[PDB]
Design a protein around this nucleic acid. Structure first.
Lengths: 149, 149, 149, 149
DNA sequence: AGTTCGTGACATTGTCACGAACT
DNA sequence: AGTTCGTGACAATGTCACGAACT
DNA sequence: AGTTCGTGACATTGTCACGAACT
DNA sequence: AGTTCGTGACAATGTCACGAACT
């Protein structure tokens, strides 16, 4: 584990997640009978501030089908929680026009690197384009002198 | 004005947005009293597919603040609704690393262009600088070949 | 007249020429009857050392058909007589193989000049061929340096 | 031995040469006495087309000196006789100015070659030097063209 | 040894065709 | 226009000097 | 003036697919 | 082999701030 896993903080996240899924209309419970599940949900609503308890609840009453998905969601939020501390470890979200993203994705795939890294290469290559043009004509002139001389 | 406003569709959107905000714990109503407020919330729960009525609610029972926000939320849901019918009108979400996004942003603001228009120029300016190292490598090869013969 | 015409000397030439034609079997006489001509010839044989007389003889008895030819032969011998004084005004006679003369004639015609002059140009061009080869490689090297540099 | 000796032909040649030399005032015979000498001259005048006899005369009545000279004269008339049957075996007579012939002779003696073989080398060595000013003018044009583009 | 033969290099002589110069 | 001249390019014939093979 | 609409720019949150690391 | 983690690439939804036209 690269990031530290704070039991207190994540249990709260898992709680909010399980609660959010419910008001969204999903099966947080593993129980099929609407009685044992209907209750498991009611109890869970109490665990709001009891971390240790939330972990237990999950073990007995949560739908096995949410197990991996939640592991993803919480895993990702953990990362994001700590990357938020310094700006160089943060990510920025932007939208690009379809066609523009397409040209950029193709580039990156072909070069074999990340979208970000590709953008950095583009910025550095595109900046030296001027120092390269003048490098062509300067080279093209010096040669024309080697001939008539 | 560009896209068309389908009253029927755009009304259910406005509804789904109210029931959602309320189930999330926000002041849908503009009545400080929990009496009049709760009174409205119940009605708005049966206006499911009665668009004719849904609007009546907004006009009569809606929180000032939420109104302005719902307005921008809908124009966005609209535009995206119609933009999703053709690829060259769709948008792609990506995430860049902070520092990489900053360098891209600096360029864009500098030139007054959008992030997509800036990626597009960088890609063309870089393809140009690349065609310069090529033509310089082609000339050294074309000339060098004739003298061997 | 560029060369001086010595009456004494040329009359002797004309005499020898007229005598040579006869022993060669020709009509030195203009006379068709073998009597007036047969005699004119006999007289001419006496003029051996009398120049002034030879001129007269020619006027009365020589075949009009030898008139131009002798003018050529004597004209040419005069030139040759004086060109023999200095070696730079002399001509030298040589034989060339058919094919060789042919290549040389073509050259001279095309350039528009004398066989001699053509031979001089050939000798001077063919001598500078070495200074021209080394002028090609030296030029071919200096250029290969302008490239890798 | 190369050419064939046509006794019939080569005999009349020997005859025409004797009657000629005698009509020119030379000692055809080898008899100091004008008696025996003139005796022979008369016989040799009827051997016109009797080759069988013509030779008998040479063996019996011919001036020593003239014999040796007639020998070289005939070998020449022979070789030319047969060389005139095909162009690439014929010879062309030209005249060069003295000084021009001298420069040509110097070269030939130097290289041990004949005058024709020397004209042939000069023509090839000059065509070579010319192909050098050409290739040097072609390269300056080929290179110069690529840099304009 | 001495001589034949072929051959390259000229010398002589004659012509022709061309164009400049003079009449 | 017609003629005289000088001239370049050959041809035709004769010699000579070599040099390699034939006697 | 005040408000609608379209729009570019992000922030949040959730997922998936991938591969390194550990068990 | 099975699982846990960090991670890059998106989607989907909501806001905000502009700016140009509609009221």
């Amino acid at each position: 584990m690269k990031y530290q896993q704070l039991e207190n903080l994540e249990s709260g996240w898992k709680w909010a997640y399980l609660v959010k899924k419910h008001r969204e209309g999903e099966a947080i419970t593993r129980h099929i009978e609407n009685s044992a599940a209907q209750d498991a949900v009611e109890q869970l609503m109490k665990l709001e501030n009891e971390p240790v308890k939330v972990q237990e609840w999950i073990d007995a009453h949560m739908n096995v089908n949410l197990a991996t998905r939640m592991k993803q969601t919480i895993r990702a939020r953990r990362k994001r929680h700590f990357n938020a501390e310094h700006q160089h470890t943060r990510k920025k979200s932007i939208d690009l026009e379809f066609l523009v993203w397409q040209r950029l994705a193709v580039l990156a795939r072909r070069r074999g690197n990340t979208l970000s890294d590709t953008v950095v290469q583009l910025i550095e290559d595109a900046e030296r384009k001027e120092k390269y043009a003048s490098q062509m004509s300067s080279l093209k002139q010096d040669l024309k002198d080697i001939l008539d001389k």
